[PDB]
Amino acid sequence: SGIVQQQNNLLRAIEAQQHLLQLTVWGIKQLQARILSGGSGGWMEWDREINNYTSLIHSLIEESQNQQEKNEQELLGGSGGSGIVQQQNNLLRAIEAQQHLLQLTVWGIKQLQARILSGGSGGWMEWDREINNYTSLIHSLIEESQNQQEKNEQELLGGSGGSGIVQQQNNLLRAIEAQQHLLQLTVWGIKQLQARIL
Amino acid sequence: XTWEXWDXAIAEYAARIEALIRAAQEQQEKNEXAL
Ligand SMILES: [Cl-]
């Protein structure tokens, strides 16, 4: 349905992934109050950094929403390759912030799991691998998106960069897909811990 | 029974995300029409 409209869907995916993630954060805090005694072992910092990246992503989503309206208002002017490219930068930044949050939730689930369950049963060894795999995959897609972004910002000045833009849509989409797998892995982990200890 | 609320909210964002990704992918395979 056109790049601007697809951008709207990526943004909506990102926002819905952030609500899902905040639900995982809630799950983790419930587990943390049963299993741990205070902010030792990195937990005070975990709480602080959950809050800091949440506030950053809220702010990136608000900026992407405003850029989205602007791009939609100017669809008939034809001219905004730079608006589309700007929105690609915004979405990438949001994805990166989401990924920091995801890595914090992964770390939390791991720290809690280590205290109450062996790492060697119940799907946990596969979980560890899948977490590692998707984290590597997401990092690779983020790196590729950063490189594509720099390239697109260059091509737009010259002849044109329509192909680079479509490729970047693909990059961002795949990153969001991979992050959804990671999110689903974190939901699984939380449910195992909840079944065990609550 | 909040956790089964929680597990509600998760599955019904999850369904929304899957729909959005599917729609964006089936936009992407139009973008690659444009290319
Ligand atoms: Cl939506």
* Integer Cα distance of A174 and A11 in angstroms: 13
Q: In the A/B pair of chains, how many CB contacts fall below 8 A?
A: 68
Find the CB nearest A13 among B10, B21, B30.
B21
Contacts of A113 (CB under 8 A, 6+ apart): A119, A124, A189, A192, A193
* Integer Cα distance of A4 and A172 in angstroms: 14
- Experimentally, the structure was elucidated by X-ray
Q: Can you tell me whether residue A50 is helix, strand or coil?
A: helix
* Integer Cα distance of A170 and B24 in angstroms: 9
Residues of B in contact with A180 (CB under 8 A): 17-18, 21
Nearest CA distance, B11 vs chain A (angstrom): 9
Of residues B1, B21, B34, B5, the one with CA closest to residue A10? B21
Angle between helices A81-116 and A124-155 (to 10 degrees): 160
b/e string for A99-120 if b means 16 or more Cβ within 10 A?
Answer: bebbbbbbebbebbbeeeeeee
Give percent helix, percent strand, percent coil of chain B, each to the nearest 5.
90, 0, 10
Of residues A135, A120, A113, the one with CA closest to residue A192? A113
DSSP code at position A158: S
Residues in chain A after which the backbone breaks (C–N beyond 2.5 Å): none
Owner of token pair 């200890």: A197
Residue B35's closest chain A neighbor by CA? A163
Alpha helices in chain A (DSSP H): 3-35, 43-73, 81-116, 124-155, 162-197
